[PDB]
Design a protein around this nucleic acid. Structure first.
Lengths: 75, 158
RNA sequence: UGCCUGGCGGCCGUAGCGCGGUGGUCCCACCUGACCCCAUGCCGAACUCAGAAGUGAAACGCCGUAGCGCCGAUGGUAGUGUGGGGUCUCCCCAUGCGAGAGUAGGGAACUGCCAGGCAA
RNA sequence: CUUUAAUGUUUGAUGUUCUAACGUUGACCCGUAAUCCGGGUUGCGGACAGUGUCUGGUGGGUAGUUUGACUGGGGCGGUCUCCUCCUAAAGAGUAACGGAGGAGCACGAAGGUUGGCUAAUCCUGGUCGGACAUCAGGAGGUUAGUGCAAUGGCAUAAGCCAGCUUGACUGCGAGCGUGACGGCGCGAGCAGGUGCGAAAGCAGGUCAUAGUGAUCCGGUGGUUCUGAAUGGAAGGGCCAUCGCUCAACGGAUAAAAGGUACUCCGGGGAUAACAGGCUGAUACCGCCCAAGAGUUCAUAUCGACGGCGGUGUUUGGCACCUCGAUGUCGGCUCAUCACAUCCUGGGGCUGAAGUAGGUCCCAAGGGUAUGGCUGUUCGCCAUUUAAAGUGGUACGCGAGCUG
RNA sequence: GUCUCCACCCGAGACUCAGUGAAAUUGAACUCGCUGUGAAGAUGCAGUGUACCCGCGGCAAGACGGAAAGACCCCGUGAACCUUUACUAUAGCUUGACACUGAACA
RNA sequence: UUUUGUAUAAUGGGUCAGCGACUUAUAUUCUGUAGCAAGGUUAACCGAAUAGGGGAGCCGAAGGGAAACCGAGUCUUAACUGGGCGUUAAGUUGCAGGGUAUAGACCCGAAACCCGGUGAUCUAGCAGGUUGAAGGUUGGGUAACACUAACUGGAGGACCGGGGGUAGGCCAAUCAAACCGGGAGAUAGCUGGUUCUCCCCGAAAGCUAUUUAGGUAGCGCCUCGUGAAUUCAUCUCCGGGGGUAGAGCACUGUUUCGGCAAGGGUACCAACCCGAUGCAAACUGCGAAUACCGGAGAAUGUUAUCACGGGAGACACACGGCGGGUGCUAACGUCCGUCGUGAAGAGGGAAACAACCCAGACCGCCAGCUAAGGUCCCAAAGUCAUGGUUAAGUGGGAAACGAUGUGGGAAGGCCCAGACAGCCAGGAUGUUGGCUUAGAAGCAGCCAUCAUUUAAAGAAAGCGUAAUAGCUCACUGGUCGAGUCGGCCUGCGCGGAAGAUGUAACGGGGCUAAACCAUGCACCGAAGCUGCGGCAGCGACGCUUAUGCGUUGUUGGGUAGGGGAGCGUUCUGUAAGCCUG
C-alpha cells in the first residue's frame, strides 16, 4: 500500500561562508526558516534566501531565541 | 476510500456516453435534454475531427462528471431500445425468410402460426418460385416477395 | 570626573529568576475631568487630550543574598578515520580527533554614544 | 402579402383500364434432321419485377488489426502523477511489490497596506454549568492557532482584530539553484500607471513545500503580418484566453476483446517440471535443566517448562552448469558401507529367586520371508522363524533389464 | 486341462522398410582407483594408493554416450487459427429517391 | 561464445585444399592535404575532344524576425541601466579518410504475406448412411389437379464414425493448406562469424525517459584534436553549517513500578498526568569522529583541471569490508551509499579454490635484496636459542554442561597450647511417645527437636529388621603427625564430537616437541626492488631547427573502445627497362 516517494526538493545550504558570491545567488534552500536573513540578504515568498549584493557570506547568532542569521559583507 | 480502478471505469463510461451522444443525430440531440453549453460543445466536437475531436469528447466527459447523467442515460436507453426492437424485427423477418427458403412446409407452419391470415397457397407458391430461382441462378425476386409479404403480415398484426 | 535618570546598539541566560534594603533630588507611574482630539465588536478596560495636587502601593534602576536556572574547565569514558589481529552477528592493538552529563570554578552582568538633577 | 377561388399552366400521391417498353426456363414458325442462340406472330403480368448511383441498419459469413509495463516459478493479487516524515549511512542526492499518510481543492477573500491584540496546559468563585459551554483573577509564554494529512519555521509573530483597496496589473528582468534536456523555482533592478501609508517601505498572490497535462490541432478578439496579375475577399502566421482521470499522467493510433495442450519460427536455467552444493524458521534423533511421578526415593522407566549437540529424510530462499534435452514415479539382478544392532556373541544394572526379562557398552563376522491392500516411495493386517532394522549412493543403476 | 474365467507354448493371420562390407562419434590424448575442492558430482586440479606392453571372450560402474536449436514451460508492441454484443470495413439483405419506366382517366 | 565470473559434467568444431563475409550509389557533418582567395566553381552541351569553349547554375563575403519590414545592426514593448540574435576570424573547389540517413547495406540463420500458374495417374475427392426438396409409385380426394398416408431414386454438400477441392488428415505418406518465377536476398529489440602485424592511450554495467525494461535518445565515463588559467589533487592553517555515532528525555510516542486517579460498572477496569526505568529508522533541551565545499600556503603529480568538435563502448555487474532496508541480525536471497578485486592483471603464499594475504609483468641475463608465507623432509631454509604450557594426536573442528588431568594468581578457616587422615575403643539408656496407640521405638511422617553420669553420646544421618535387634556416623580418649578442605581467574586438555565408494575435520611422512604463548638472530621466499645490457611513447635542456641525439627524468598489465605506425598478394604506368632454357 505504501511506497509513494516524492522527488527531493533539493533542500540544503547552497552557498557557505567565506566565499564570494554575486547578487541574486541562492544561499540556502530550506522549507522553513532555519536560517533568517540579515544585512544585504533577502527572503522570498517560499523562504528562499538570496544575496542583494556581491560579497562574502557570514553566519551569526542573534535574537532572544538564539536564531542563526545570514549576512553578506562587501569583501 | 474510492478505488482508482472504479474512478477510471466511471470515466470510461462517461467518455463512452459522450461519444454516443456525439454520434447521435440532430433529432436524437433535440429529444435528449442537453443544456445549451453542452449542446454547443457537442456541435463543435462534431464539426472538428482528428485528436481535437477526442479531446473535445474528453472535455464533454469531464463536464458530465459534475453534471447529472440520469436523464441522458434514460433517453439513450429508450432510443437504443426502439432501435433494437426494429433490428430484432428485421432479423426475425430475415430468419423466417431463410427458413422458408431452406426447409419449406416446416417454416410455412411457423409462418401460419405467427400470422393466421397468411395465405398458405401463396406462401407455397413463393417458396417454390424461390427454389426454382436458386436452382436456375435467377434473381431472388421470390425471396424479396416473401420478405415483403412477411413485412405486410407483421404490419397488419401490429 | 563620580552618585544617578531617559533613549539608542553589542554581547544577548556567568548576562536570567526567588528574598531583603534603597529612590522621588532629575526622570517614570498612578491620578482629577474627558463635554470638546481620539476609543471600545459595551466601557477613558487599552490608547489619547490640560494638569500635577500627592505619593512611590505596583512597575521600574542599584546593592547583597548562591537559593535555583546557566556557563564551565582538567582527566576519564562512549564514539570515530586509517592498517592489522582475534575464541570475528563482537572486541583489541598503534595512531589522529573526540564526546554528553557531572566535576574545580564563575555567576547578582559588562560595555560605546547622546540628552538631564546633584556634587565637581 | 395571413385568411378567398370559377377560370388558363406545372408536376407529386392514391384508385381503375390498356400495352407500346420490359419479363416470358408460355406456345408456334425459320437458320435448324439444332433441348443453345438469334429473326417474326400470339397469350399472360406490366410500368410492376429488375437494372446503375446515393440513402438507412443488419453486419466474423468475409478482410486488416489489437488486447501495455512491474511481480520470491507461473497464474492471481497489487502499482503507473504530485507532496510531507524515516528508511536514506549528519554536503547534496539515494532504490526496494518498505513503513505512515495527504493531494488532481479553495480563497475577489482567507490577498496587499496601514494601526493594534495575543491560547492552552490547571486551579480558584459563581443559576442551569458538573471533569470540561460563558464570566473575573492567578503559575503560564506558544506546547493554542498557523483552512487541508504531514514537515519546518511563525513572538519582530507568518497567529488574531480594524479603515481603504485589487500589485492576483502591464513588457521585462542581470544573476542564481535545479535538473541530460524539455522545463521548473527564486530573483535585485528597469519603463508605465495604480492600492496603503506623513515615510523610510510593501503589494509581480495565499507563511512555504502537493491542487497538476508539454507538443500538434479547434473556438473566441485583435493584428492588412502575409494575401500567390491588380483591389479585395478567402486561406495561412503572431499574440491572450478557453479546450485533455492523453490517471499507461515525458503524453507511439481520434479508433481494438479470448485463448490455440490444433501450433510454427528465434531466444530463455535472465526462467521452469526433476536432480548436487550454499543455506536451517520448521521437523527428526540424542543430551542438560528435569518440577515431580514411579510404596517413598530425580534418573529400573518416564521426566512438566526451557536450554544444548548430529541429520538434512517434508514444509523455507538463489538457481552457481545443465530448454545445441536432467526421459519421472513402480518393479527385477547387484548391492558395498555405519552401527543410532532385528536378532546372532561377550557383557553392567533392578522393583533380575530361573525362562522371562526392561534398560545400557562393545561387537557388522552372519544373515534379516510368504500372502490381501496401491502403477505407487510409503502405510495396515495374517502365518513361521533368530529376525523379517534403518539409512545414503543422481528420492542408484531404462550407456544392467522391465513401461 | 475338452470346457468354462482366463493365462502360457508349438505353427499362421492382423500390422511391423538394418544393410553398406555401414553406422551413430570424433578438438587432441601416453584416456587408473579413492579423499577435498573446483561455474559446486574430476580419466586431466592438491594429497594418497595401485598398475609389465598389447591382443582375444564376457560384465557394465563411469566418459553429465549418440538419435529430436525440448516432445515440459515461458518470452516476441513475431506469424497463422478459429470466437465475438473488441476497433476499422466488406459479400448478401432489405428503405426510399433519381433514368431505363409508360398512355388514358376520377 | 553467452554469462561479472569457465577445461570445468553451460554452447560449438574430424582433418586437409579451395570458396567468404563493412564494398558501391545518392545527400549531409567533421579531420589531413593542394590551388584560388572575397572569389571559387562548373553541370548538361559543343568539343580532331582526360585539352579548350561553355558563368546556365551552386556557396559565403551581413544578418534579425514567421512575415511585412529594417539593416551593422534587427526582434516583444511607447523604449529602456534592458534582454534575444548579428560585426570586430575567409569562403570555395578536388582528393583521401572518420560518421550520419536511404538503397540488400558487414554476412548467415526463420515462420509468415501477395501475385500467375504446375494442379488430382500417389493421396483427399464419384466410399456409405443420414438430414434431405426435386422424379416416379401405391393409397383419400378430385372428370382430372394441388395436398397429404406409406415405398423407391438422392439432390444436396454436408452432416457422420492449390488462397481451392476433397486424423499438422490429403492434393511428392509431418499440408485447417505443396511447389514453382517474382515483390523478396521480405522483416526479425534474436543465434553465430567478421581473416595480417607493431606502438600509445584505454572505461562501464551508473542517473533521466521510454506501449519501456536483454533495446534505445541525452547525461555519467573512455579515446583523438583545438584553446585556456597555481587549472585541478593530497596535506597544513582558517569559515561555516548537520542531527549521524555517542549521550539524553526539553518535546512526540512506547513497557513497567506506586500514586493523582476523570470516566466506567465501591473489595473493581481506567483517561489527562507525576518521579524513575529501558527503547525509538519515522524524539533531540546536547552532540561528535568522518564528509561538503570556500580563502591562503611550501612541496610534489608529463595540466593529473576546465570548454568545444570527431569517434566509441557500455546502458544485466558478482564477491569481500564498511553502516543499513526486507528475509528468521541465514545464505553464494534481494535492494541501498562508499573502497578494493575481477569484469579490464598473471605473479608468490593459504595443498588445490574468481571474490582470502602480499604484490601491478617493456624485453633479456645461470646476480643479489625483499613483501605475505615458511626455515625436520617431501619442498628452500633453524631438527636455532631464551622462560613457560600440553600426556589428550589436544595441535589436526565444533557449543551450554560435569569434573582429584595439569602450572600459577588473590586469598579463608583450621594449624607442634601437635592441622587432615591413619592405627586401638565408646556412641550407653527413658525416647516400646503422647501422636494415625495397627509396631515405625530416629532410621516415611504431625512433633517437641528436651532431660542425670559426663574425656562422650542425639529424644537421631546411613546400612540394616514387619517394628525389635545388630553394623557405621554426629563427637569423644591412647600413638604418630605437620600440612588439609572448599569456590573463582584460570591458559593448555577430557565425554558430549556416532553414517554410509577406500584412511579423509594436520596434505602426507611423521612429530611428546618437529604442537602453542612472547622475543631475537639470520636464511628461504614474487615478474616487488636493486646489478648489467637492448627496444619504444613523453616534457625539456645542448646542438640538429624536417633528424641524430651529449642526454635528464618518466612511462611501456589490459578487455571493449579510440589514436598512431607498418608488412603480405592481384592488376595499371613506371616497364619496348631488369632477370630469365
Amino acid at each position: 500500500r505504501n511506497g509513494r516517494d516524492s522527488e527531493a526538493k533539493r533542500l540544503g545550504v547552497k552557498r557557505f561562508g567565506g566565499e564570494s558570491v554575486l547578487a541574486g545567488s541562492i544561499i540556502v534552500r530550506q522549507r522553513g526558516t532555519k536560517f533568517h536573513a540579515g544585512a544585504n540578504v533577502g527572503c522570498g515568498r517560499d523562504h528562499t534566501l538570496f544575496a542583494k549584493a556581491d560579497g562574502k557570506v557570514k553566519f551569526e547568532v542573534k535574537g532572544p531565541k538564539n536564531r542563526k542569521f545570514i549576512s553578506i559583507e562587501a569583501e | 476510500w474510492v478505488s482508482k480502478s472504479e474512478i477510471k471505469r466511471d470515466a470510461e463510461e462517461l467518455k463512452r456516453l459522450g461519444a454516443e451522444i456525439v454520434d447521435l443525430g440532430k433529432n436524437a440531440l433535440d429529444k435528449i435534454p442537453l443544456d445549451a453549453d453542452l449542446r454547443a460543445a457537442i456541435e463543435l466536437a462534431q464539426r472538428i475531427k482528428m485528436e481535437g475531436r477526442r479531446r473535445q469528447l474528453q472535455l464533454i466527459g469531464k463536464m458530465l462528471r459534475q453534471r447529472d447523467v440520469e436523464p441522458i442515460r434514460q433517453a439513450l436507453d429508450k432510443l437504443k431500445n426502439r432501435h433494437n426492437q426494429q433490428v430484432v424485427l428485421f432479423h426475425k423477418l430475415e430468419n423466417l425468410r431463410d427458413r422458408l427458403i431452406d426447409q419449406g412446409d416446416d417454416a410455412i407452419a411457423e409462418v401460419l402460426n405467427l400470422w393466421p391470415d397468411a395465405d398458405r397457397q401463396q406462401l407455397r407458391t413463393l417458396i417454390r418460385n424461390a427454389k426454382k430461382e436458386k436452382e436456375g441462378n435467377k434473381p431472388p425476386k421470390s425471396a424479396r416477395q416473401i420478405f415483403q409479404y412477411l413485412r405486410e403480415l407483421a404490419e397488419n398484426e401490429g
